Amino acid sequence: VEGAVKTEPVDLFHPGFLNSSNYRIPALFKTKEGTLIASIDARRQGGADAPNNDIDTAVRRSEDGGKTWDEGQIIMDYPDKSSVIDTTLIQDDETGRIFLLVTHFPSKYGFWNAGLGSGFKNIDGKEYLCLYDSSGKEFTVRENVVYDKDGNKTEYTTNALGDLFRNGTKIDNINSSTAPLKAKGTSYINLVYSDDDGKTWSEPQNINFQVKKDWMKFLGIAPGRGIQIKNGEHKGRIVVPVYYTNEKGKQSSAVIYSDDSGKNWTIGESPNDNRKLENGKIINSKTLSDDAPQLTECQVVEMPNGQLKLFMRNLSGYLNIATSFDGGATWDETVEKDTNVLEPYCQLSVINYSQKIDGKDAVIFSNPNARSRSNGTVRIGLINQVGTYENGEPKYEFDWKYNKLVKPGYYAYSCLTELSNGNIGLLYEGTPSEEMSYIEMNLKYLES
């Protein structure tokens, strides 16, 4: 219509950018200062997931509302087919610190063959990263010094990038396929941060010791963004969607969260914990042994009173939504299936919108509206309180009042942001692993 805006797509990442052949897995976030940060997997050896690749994390910034973007930078890169995969962005409003988290695998490891547990061992009240030699002998890294099983210092030291030094000379990296001492072959959650609006980034901090349980095999970032809670008793809490597998390989969603501006993290329960299924049975994420109830990648939004809603990739064919009354620590037993929203087993994006639409609080949602990864559609969901739970808490559901096709044909992972001008930015996989497309839309367009 007149005044409607939908910009022509720009290839924000593409083959050749930063000398990467392939790209996947978008994250997009507007900072407190108004800067757009876009992160992505720079998939260097094709488009496949780890372990069949060598994947680095790339970031671009825009200081003019997404009209122009910088030359990009690689902010994490491990050697020899060790990969960082699946990024997420959030910022602490209090300190201004921006966080990017990502899943990290040593060479040869991925989802399917990840070992159990955090990869850390507790020695006298502190968690230390374990290393193993080819015989399976176990060592610990204590303040970057490698100790043997009997507590004796060895000739080895490490750095935060995993480099392995013998008497101060680098010989390998503990994440490579050739190191004489290697980290456990499993998933790790890495965190980096920026205190200058995304221009420079810290080295990765491995937070597996805080968030990964002994019985988890895979634990990964659910890519996109996090939130910081605005209302209620958990105001200020930083919440980052994740998902994990149990010993039987079955997937369950959750969030990790920090109440101290990102310094310390913990993981909450999954909506699969004490979940009541349609058949009336109760399950738990630790014991889940069936494929059908799996809950995987997810994104979280906040209701008017602070209540959290976790929107989840799943196997039902439709959107699933979980509810938390305690800031992500636990979830209500009922996972809602919203049959107005197809979910063809793919990542989705959902964000809060800052102003009311048609007199209602609203969210913006993006995914492939089909039984395949196609028909990419952005929706406006208006929030309605439809009743209360037995515990007296408000019960909220969504009215998907406006639903707009934005990408005919291929559409896979995506990430939304609200822009400074009130419009919506969207970075999406409009090709399987090549060009990643950015557009800006206004509400006039979305409602048309």
Contact footprint for Ca ion (CB under 5 A): 54, 56, 77
CB 82 → Ca ion: shortest distance, Å? 7
What per-residue string of b and e applies to 238-273 under the rule 16 or more CB within 10 Å gives b? bbbbbbbbbeeebbbbbbbbbeebbeebebbbbbbb
Of 133, 137, 181, 178, which Cα lies nearest the Cα of 156? Answer: 181
CB 439 → Ca ion: shortest distance, Å? 30
Pairing of the two strands 224-225 and 83-91: parallel
- How many angstroms separate the CA atoms of 243 and 103, rounded? 11
3-class SS at 284?
coil
Is 49 catalytic? The answer is yes
Sheet strands (E) in 10-54: 10-13, 22-30, 36-43
Is 302 catalytic? The answer is no
Task: Tell me: is residue 273 an annotated ligand-binding position.
Answer: no
The answer, yes or no, to whether the previous bond of 223 is cis (omega within 30 of 0) is no
CB 77 → Ca ion: shortest distance, Å? 4
Identify which of residues 162 and 425 has a Cβ nearer to Ca ion in the complex.
162
CB 256 → Ca ion: shortest distance, Å? 25
Identify which of residues 77 and 197 has a Cβ nearer to Ca ion in the complex.
77
Task: Tell me: is residue 291 an annotated ligand-binding position.
Answer: no
Bridge partners (DSSP) of residue 360 are 357
Residue with the CB atom nearest Ca ion in the bound state: 77
Identify which of residues 48 and 329 has a Cβ nearer to Ca ion in the complex.
48
Task: Tell me: is residue 197 an annotated ligand-binding position.
Answer: no
CB 161 → Ca ion: shortest distance, Å? 11
- How many angstroms separate the CA atoms of 227 and 123, rounded? 34
Identify which of residues 56 and 92 has a Cβ nearer to Ca ion in the complex.
56
CA trace torsion 306, 286, 333, 302 (10° rounding):
20
What per-residue string of b and e applies to 8-23 under the rule 16 or more CB within 10 Å gives b? ebbebbeeebbebebb
Q: Which of 86, 269, 273, 297 is catalytic?
A: 297
Q: Which of 49, 269, 302, 332 is catalytic?
A: 49
CA 321 to chain centre: 17
Token pair recorded at residue 248: 């039987």
CA 300 to chain centre: 11
Task: Tell me: is residue 54 an annotated ligand-binding position.
Answer: yes
Identify which of residues 75 and 342 has a Cβ nearer to Ca ion in the complex.
75
Identify which of residues 59 and 308 has a Cβ nearer to Ca ion in the complex.
59
CB 56 → Ca ion: shortest distance, Å? 5
- How many angstroms separate the CA atoms of 253 and 101, rounded? 16
CB 134 → Ca ion: shortest distance, Å? 23
Of 118, 88, 102, which Cα lies nearest the Cα of 417? Answer: 88
CA 153 to chain centre: 37
| Cβ neighbourhood burial of 225 (10 Å; 0-12, 13-18, 19+) | buried
Identify which of residues 189 and 406 has a Cβ nearer to Ca ion in the complex.
189
Residues at the binding site for Ca(2+) are: 54, 56, 77-78
Residues at the binding site are: 54, 56, 77-78
- The set of catalytic residues is 49, 297
